[PDB]
């Protein structure tokens, strides 16, 4: 997160870190048992960490569980990101507890001016490289679809909505890919893409999760 601020923590409980030996993507859980993610966050290996605040420092409240099975979504095309949406199993259900919690799933998508908490343990620098250790935040609102058609000419599907700030300085960016963006406290988005972070007219790109709410709920259920 470039522009941002420090969260607290544990107040976003709905927040994980996908860790593979070192914290590498977000992810938001989304009941006892399963996670979203981005599908371009896949890899084999992952343990699910719940409860971070400092991704480095064992502070009482994380719950650390294997990933039992990772579903990409059927339709993920790795070049142009259209449908970057995963699924996650733990192996074991999380307890939840006021610091681990689930998130809601949106039952309508979100519009354009809504504002978003969208978070983190990406980057922190736009011209630089500068990893946290405890988790960042950013307030941002969900932009018109023909603004963010105008930003990424040819790019954006009905799949994709563009959240954050045309001026620059404020937005997601690498290392926090798969985490959350969640609005009026439903999960609207995931982290997905973007030309470089927090540049002067190109804002983030993220994953429009209330067109994948059918494909969730049933694959969960078989699963
Ligand atoms: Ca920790």
Known sequence: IVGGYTCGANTVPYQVSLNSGYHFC??????SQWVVSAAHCYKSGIQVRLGEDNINVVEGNEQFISASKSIVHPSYNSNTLNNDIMLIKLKSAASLNSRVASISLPTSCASAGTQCLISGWGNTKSSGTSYPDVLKCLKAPILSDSS???????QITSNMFCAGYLEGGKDSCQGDSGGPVVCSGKLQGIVSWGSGCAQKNKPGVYTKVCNYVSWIKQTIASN
Not at 26 to 31: D, K, R, V, Y
Not at 148 to 154: D, E, F, L
């Open 26 to 31: 977000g992810g938001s859980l989304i009941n």
């Open 148 to 154: 963010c058609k105008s930003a990424y000419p040819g």
